[PDB]
Design a protein around this ligand. Structure first.
Ligand SMILES: Cc1cc2nc3c(=O)[nH]c(=O)nc-3n(C[C@H](O)[C@H](O)[C@H](O)COP(=O)(O)O)c2cc1C
Ligand code: SF4
Ligand code: FES
Lengths: 213, 431, 87
């Protein structure tokens, strides 16, 4: 949790990184989304791309993005250390992120944190010896009505209970892909035990349209 | 006039695929009435569209609640040579708020159509949809929905066949609540730290890439096509005067059935919780406090919750605000000081650090509130914390500073005896 | 940044030899005027005082900071170099 860089044998400007040819084509499309003369707007998406290819951001990757976009390296470092989704240390294969802000706290997200810690034998902020799971607390993930919820890599797992989360870790260790979403009865954000709205057939085109178009 | 509000009907609900029970891709969206007579709306001109939005009484759904037709009309002016843009705020970062998430993934074509309709009103050439980076799957749904519209001629060159060129770009965030702030969002698009800008200049003059920009919430833009189709008067027939239309509500916390639901504005808070959320856990009598509009709004105790309505003007009178309309319910088992202390901890982790009162003050408030949770303080410190919050409020660059102060003030305003009691317990234990 | 010490005119005299005291190394002087500094409201007041006391003098014209054109908006220019890369 430090915001200074000290070169180490596995993280220095000579650490091998470079985009694959497939990613170099994705980068071209990213840059075309912005006006000519404002290529620096691509810093966030291109940095994220480097992390998706590599899993984390060595300083060499930051320099590579700076070189590609012709942006001073410090301006890339500033972005990398501001946004919390960028990993400047290697993380596990599965980055478990437990929301602990108040709405999730009110639904016993602490029990979810306990279940993950007891099952994995690690503490918040640590990685397992096998380097499969890294566990952190995060702020509201925009799924508060489905609390308690966690994010693992790109997926949300919601309305959790200590049992449900323990199963998901079993599925990940075994190599399977657990389907995202609520683990209770419901499918998304509707009230449990039956809809209280949107029960009628949706109205079709042209319904209630004002005269004169 | 109408005197009671609520009991909205499905016939009059804008977001009809709120629960993902129907197809979210273009075929489903069209059958539900999206993209219908979009060409007619575009050929009626910006002044007609802004008038429809002006007459609808729509107010910003992002939190500030600023009237939308007036705000969008700031772009209604001759071009000086720069391009014009509509930035759509899909950051959805306010704790308790998840309404924009359902719109993006289940009704993406309403947002995409809203981008074009609102973009036409402002004369914008494209819309950038800034969606928080943690919504990867929702962002992929939106790009799929955007691809279908491009392939149907509904956007891009000669959009809908109106002779109007409009692009819809999706750009993802990288983890920062402060990038929901309008100007901090713009700096993020430009590839900088998400730090807000001072105003003036206002974004309608100098915005993204230094160009005229309007930042609109996802919900504000997603309802815009329907208001144009069904008319502003239809939308204005809902909710109290100046508090018009249908609102998305998130009821979370200590309810039986936490959910997102669309309900008429000015619905009573009590009715909303009982009707849709199944009521407070342990009975309505087990209610302690409610945060009515997301974490930034001050809480209210059970007594106020009894009769308060859910709209901008009603909640201002209760010394709070509608905010994002995210209702966080706390029953009597809650450690209220701990619950509010966790929100101040959230603002501490989300402050961009740019400006002094929030960079230093919020962290100071967090350190004090942590001691209040344990009672390791003195009663005189309560008035000191109130004064500190007033030194943050109204002195910072952006409204995150105000949003950190208000929860603290709400706790002190309604639960001061609880704070003093905890200090009494701590003092007598170490006595 | 404070400018409160640039309000008044000063008259000082030419610096003369200081040497090290053999016993202690302190700074010795034989110039009785080494610490004499007078304050005047205007340049004319200072010159008049110097003339009547018989001192030759040099007058240096007051330096006033140039008036600058500041604009927060320029930091985000669409097409100018004043666009800042960081805040
Ligand atoms: C700290 C902070 C976070 C914000 N987050 C969001 C957000 O996630 N979504 C949003 O629409 N508005 C957010 N806002 C409000 C925006 O600054 C802005 O008022 C709003 O996006 C304008 O859109 P509207 O007029 O349609 O409501 C936030 C404001 C602050 C101060
Ligand atoms: S109030 Fe906080 S988040 Fe807003 S600009 Fe100041 S330091 Fe940044
Ligand atoms: S409080 Fe956890 S998702 Fe919002």
């Amino acid at each position: 949790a430090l915001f200074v860089h000290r070169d180490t044998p596995e993280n220095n400007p000579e650490t091998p990184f470079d985009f694959t040819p497939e990613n170099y084509k994705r980068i071209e499309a990213i840059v075309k989304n912005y006006p000519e003369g404002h290529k620096a707007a691509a810093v966030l998406p291109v940095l994220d791309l480097a992390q998706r290819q590599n899993g984390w951001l060595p300083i060499s990757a930051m320099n590579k993005v700076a070189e590609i976009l012709q942006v001073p390296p410090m301006r890339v470092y500033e972005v990398a250390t501001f946004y919390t989704m960028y990993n400047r240390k290697p993380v596990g294969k599965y980055h478990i992120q437990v929301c602990t802000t108040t709405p999730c706290m009110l639904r016993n997200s602490d029990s979810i944190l306990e279940a993950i810690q007891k099952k994995l034998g690690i503490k918040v902020g640590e990685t397992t010896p096998d380097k499969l799971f890294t566990l952190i607390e995060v702020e509201c993930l925009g799924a508060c009505v489905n609390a308690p919820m966690v994010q693992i890599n790109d997926n949300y797992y919601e309305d959790l209970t200590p049992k449900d989360i323990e199963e998901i870790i079993d599925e990940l260790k075994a190599g399977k892909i657990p389907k995202p979403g609520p683990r209770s009865g419901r499918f998304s954000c509707e009230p449990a035990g039956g809809l209280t709205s949107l029960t009628e057939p949706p109205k079709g085109p042209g319904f209630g349209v004002q005269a004169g178009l | 006039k109408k005197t009671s509000f609520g009991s909205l009907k499905d016939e009059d609900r804008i977001f009809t695929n709120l629960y993902g029970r129907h197809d979210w891709r273009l075929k489903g969206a069209q059958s539900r009435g999206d993209w219908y007579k979009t060409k007619e709306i575009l050929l009626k001109g910006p002044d007609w569209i802004l008038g429809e939005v002006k007459t609808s009484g729509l107010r910003g759904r992002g939190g500030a609640g600023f009237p939308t037709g007036l705000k969008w009309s700031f772009m209604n002016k001759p071009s000086d040579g720069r391009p014009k843009y509509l930035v759509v705020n899909a950051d959805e970062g306010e704790p308790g708020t998840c309404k924009d998430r359902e719109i993006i993934r289940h009704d993406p074509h309403k947002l995409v159509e809203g981008c074009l309709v609102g973009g036409r009103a402002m004369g914008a050439r494209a819309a950038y949809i800034y969606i928080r980076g943690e919504f990867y799957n929702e962002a992929s749904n939106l790009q799929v929905a955007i691809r279908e519209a491009y392939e149907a001629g509904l956007i891009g060159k000669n959009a809908c066949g109106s002779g109007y060129d409009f692009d819809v770009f999706v750009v993802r965030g990288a983890g920062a609540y402060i990038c929901g702030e309008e100007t901090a969002l713009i700096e993020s698009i430009e590839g900088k730290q998400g730090k807000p800008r001072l105003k003036p200049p206002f974004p309608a003059d100098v915005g993204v890439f230094g160009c005229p920009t309007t930042v609109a919430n996802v919900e504000t833009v997603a309802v815009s096509p329907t208001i144009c189709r069904r008319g502003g008067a239809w939308f204005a027939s809902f909710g109290r005067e100046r508090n018009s239309g249908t609102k998305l509500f998130n009821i979370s916390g200590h309810v039986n059935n936490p959910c997102t639901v669309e309900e008429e504005m000015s619905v009573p808070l009590k009715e909303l919780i009982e009707k849709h959320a199944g009521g407070v856990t342990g009975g309505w009598d087990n209610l302690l406090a409610v945060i009515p509009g997301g974490s930034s709004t001050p809480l209210i105790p059970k007594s106020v919750c009894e009769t308060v309505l859910m709209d901008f003007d009603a909640l201002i009178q209760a010394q709070t605000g509608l905010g994002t309309a995210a209702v966080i319910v706390m029953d009597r088992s809650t450690d209220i000081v701990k619950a509010i202390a966790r929100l101040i901890e959230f603002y501490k982790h989300e402050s961009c650090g740019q400006c002094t009162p929030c960079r230093e003050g919020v962290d100071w408030m967090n350190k004090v509130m942590a001691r209040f949770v344990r009672g390791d303080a003195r009663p005189a410190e309560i008035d000191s914390l109130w004064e500190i919050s007033k030194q943050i409020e109204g002195h910072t660059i952006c409204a995150l500073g105000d949003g950190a102060a208000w929860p603290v003030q709400g706790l002190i305003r309604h639960f001061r005896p609880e704070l003093e009691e905890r200090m009494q317990q701590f003092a007598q234990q170490h006595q | 940044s404070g400018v409160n010490n640039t309000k008044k005119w000063k008259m000082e005299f030419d610096t003369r030899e200081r040497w090290e005291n053999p016993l202690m190394g302190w700074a010795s002087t034989a110039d009785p005027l080494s610490n004499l500094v007078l304050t005047f409201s205007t340049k004319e007041d200072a010159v008049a005082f110097a003339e009547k006391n018989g001192w030759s003098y040099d007058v240096e014209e007051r330096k006033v900071p140039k008036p600058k054109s500041k604009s927060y908006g320029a930091n985000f220019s669409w097409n100018k170099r004043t666009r800042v890369s960081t805040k």
